[PDB]
């Protein structure tokens, strides 16, 4: 009887649409996202405790662009995620490309939104001699990791159980950014719109320092101080955005080094 909203997000070709169809069945409506013709499909399903509305978000590899430009999918996903409309997210992860998918995963966890990872393509990974340590991954992410076992799925039943048990993510250490980057990002966050949570304002600060233009619309007055902050950081270190990317690759590489093993 309790209402609950979940956003479904993952990379393109992660199995997310198939999972959507499996969860909602015939209980779906299709429209378009506001102001664009990009399709917005959402549906309903029930758990033991909740009546769930599932919103299918457009596929994306990340919520940020530091190069290039247009991405209506990425702007829609980023805007919805930052709106706070969803009570939680299901992040569909391709097990056979775990390292690639964990960038988006890391962005969600750094935003601090309640998240359940749905681990998909397990059969492909296994046939390709890849095995993933689910509990090690969950320990490092601070959120549940559910293998989507297809046989009598069952995978969906485990997923619904986690939905009924959803809670805040654990405040684990994820990316280890340089302290000057953290300080300047915090100084930018402090001047952003007050109605935005502080974790999200700090994340936005780091993204602007990396050079994301998608965020700046959300950062309000912070955009007026970004050049002075960048000047200080450039005094502290060569290419601070490169330092950000290196920190991220380090984190993901370590996680994959522990979590992903050969079956044979």
Report CA Rg, the chain: 19
With the C-alpha atoms ordered 177, 255, 171, 10, is the resulting torsion angle positive or negative?
Answer: positive
Q: For the chain, first and last CA: distance in Å?
A: 47
Distance CA 114, CA 169 (A): 6
Does residue 122 have a known ligand-binding role? Answer: yes
Does residue 55 have a known ligand-binding role? Answer: no
Does residue 18 have a known ligand-binding role? Answer: no
Does residue 7 have a known ligand-binding role? Answer: no
The resolution in angstroms reads 3.2
Q: Is 114 helix (H, G, I), strand (E, B) or coil?
A: coil
Does residue 171 have a known ligand-binding role? Answer: no
CATH architecture of 1-174: 3-Layer(aba) Sandwich (3.40)
Does residue 10 have a known ligand-binding role? Answer: yes
Distance CA 195, CA 185 (A): 17
What are the extents of the domains in the chain?
Answer: 1-174, 175-264
Does residue 145 have a known ligand-binding role? Answer: no
Rounding to the nearest 10 degrees, give the CA dihedral for residues 6, 8, 9, 11. Answer: 160
Are the beta carbons of 155 and 92 closer than 8 angstroms?
no
215 to 68, 94, 203: CA distances (angstroms): 15, 27, 9
The conformational region for residue 13 under phi > 0 = left, psi -120 to 50 = alpha, else beta, is: left
Does residue 16 have a known ligand-binding role? Answer: yes
Are the beta carbons of 63 and 141 closer than 8 angstroms?
no
Distance CA 126, CA 122 (A): 6
Which method, experimentally, gave rise to this model? X-ray
Q: Is the peptide bond before 154 cis (omega within 30 degrees of 0)?
A: yes
- Closest to 20 (Cα-Cα) out of 107, 97, 151, 118: 118
Are the beta carbons of 123 and 149 closer than 8 angstroms?
no
Does residue 105 have a known ligand-binding role? Answer: no
Strands across the sheet containing 88-94:
28-32, 39-46, 50-56, 2-10, 88-94, 115-120, 145-147
Are the beta carbons of 113 and 86 closer than 8 angstroms?
yes
Q: Which residues have C-beta within 8 Å of that of residue 179, sequence separation ≥ 6?
A: none
DSSP state of 59: P
159 to 19, 104, 121, 145, 147: CA distances (angstroms): 11, 20, 15, 9, 9
186 to 110, 182, 192: CA distances (angstroms): 14, 6, 10
Does residue 24 have a known ligand-binding role? Answer: yes
Q: Which residues have C-beta within 8 Å of that of residue 173, sequence separation ≥ 6?
A: none
Are the beta carbons of 93 and 14 closer than 8 angstroms?
yes
Same fold, 1-174 and 175-264: no
Does residue 93 have a known ligand-binding role? Answer: no
Does residue 197 have a known ligand-binding role? Answer: no
Does residue 30 have a known ligand-binding role? Answer: no
* Last residue before each gap in the chain (C to N over 2.5 A): none
H helix intervals, the chain: 16-24, 72-83, 98-111, 122-127, 134-141, 155-164, 179-189, 198-210, 213-219, 226-236, 240-259
Does residue 32 have a known ligand-binding role? Answer: no
Rounding to the nearest 10 degrees, give the CA dihedral for residues 127, 129, 134, 137. Answer: -130
Does residue 195 have a known ligand-binding role? Answer: no
For the record, the structure tokens of 139 come out as: 């320990």
Does residue 159 have a known ligand-binding role? Answer: no
Q: Which residues have C-beta within 8 Å of that of residue 156, sequence separation ≥ 6?
A: 22, 23, 148
Distance CA 55, CA 19 (A): 12
Does residue 211 have a known ligand-binding role? Answer: no
Does residue 155 have a known ligand-binding role? Answer: no
Does residue 235 have a known ligand-binding role? Answer: no
Does residue 12 have a known ligand-binding role? Answer: yes
- Closest to 244 (Cα-Cα) out of 199, 210, 201: 210
* CATH classification code of 175-264: 1.10.287.1770
Does residue 15 have a known ligand-binding role? Answer: yes
Does residue 70 have a known ligand-binding role? Answer: no
């Amino acid at each position: 009887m309790k209402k609950l909203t979940i956003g479904l997000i993952g990379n393109p070709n992660s199995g997310k649409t198939t999972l959507f169809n499996q969860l909602t069945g015939a209980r779906q409506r299709v429209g378009n996202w506001a102001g664009v013709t990009v399709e917005r499909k959402e549906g309903q399903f029930s758990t033991t405790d909740h009546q769930v509305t599932l919103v299918d978000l457009p596929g994306t590899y990340s919520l940020t662009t530091i190069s290039s430009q247009t991405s209506l999918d990425e702007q829609i996903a980023c805007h919805y995620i930052l709106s706070g409309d969803a009570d939680l997210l299901i992040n569909v992860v391709d097990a056979s490309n775990l390292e690639r998918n964990l960038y988006l995963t890391l962005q969600l966890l750094e935003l601090g939104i309640p998240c359940i990872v749905a681990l998909n393509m397990l059969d492909i990974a296994e046939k390709q001699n890849i095995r993933i340590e689910i509990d090690a991954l969950s320990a490092r992410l601070g959120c549940p990791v559910i293998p989507l076992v297809s046989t009598r799925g069952r995978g969906i039943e485990a997923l619904k159980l986690a939905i009924d048990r959803y809670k805040a993510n654990e405040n684990v250490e994820l990316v280890h950014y340089a302290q000057p980057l953290l300080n300047e990002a915090d100084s930018l966050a402090k001047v952003m719109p007050s109605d935005i949570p502080l974790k999200q304002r700090r994340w936005l600060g780091l993204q602007m320092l990396e050079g994301d233009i998608y965020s700046r619309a959300y950062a309000g007055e912070a955009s007026q101080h970004l050049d002075a902050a960048l000047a200080r950081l450039r005094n502290e270190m060569d290419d601070p955005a490169l330092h950000i990317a290196d920190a991220r690759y380090q984190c993901i590489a370590a996680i994959c080094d522990v979590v992903s093993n050969t079956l044979t």
